Amino acid sequence: DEWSYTGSSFYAPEPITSLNTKYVAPQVTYQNISTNLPPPLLGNSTGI
Amino acid sequence: DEWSYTGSSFYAPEPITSLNTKYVAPQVTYQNISTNLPPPLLGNSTGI
């Protein structure tokens, strides 16, 4: 259940990053991911 | 003097957040808020 990103006009899966995603409000149709958490969804909890 | 956000085509006040706002250069016609500081304008000053 890994998730990748592809362009709308050509099939070529790529890693999900902040350059191809945008933050949005939650919806009932969205997938709730538990593991492997692509970098944009990584909640930063690395303090001193 | 609370400020809310509404969609351009239907009146329904909502809280101000980073999802419905965008950062811009200051203008002379902007309101200078002192209290209640919606979350986008909250200057983070929480170190250890």
**What is d(CA B39, CA B18) in angstroms, rounded to the nearest whole number?**
8
Phi, psi values for residue A15, rounded to 5°: -65, 150
Q: Is A25 on the interface with B (CB under 8 A)?
A: yes
* Cβ contact A16:A25 at 8 Å: no
CA distance B46 to B43: 9
- Please tell me which residue of chain B has the smallest CA distance to A23: B19
Place of tokens 């009932």: A28
DSSP string, A1-48: ----EEETTEEEEE---TTS-------TTS----SS--GGG-------
- The two structure tokens encoding residue B32: 């200078």
Whether the CB of B21 is below 8 Å from some CB of chain A: the reply is no
The resolution of the experimental structure, rounded to one decimal in Å, is 2.5
In this structure, which amino acid lies at residue A36?
N
Residue type for position B13: P
- For chain A, give the residues followed by a break (C–N over 2.5 Å): none
Residue type, B30: Y
Give yes or no for B12 touching A (CB within 8 A): no
Alpha helices in chain B (DSSP H): none
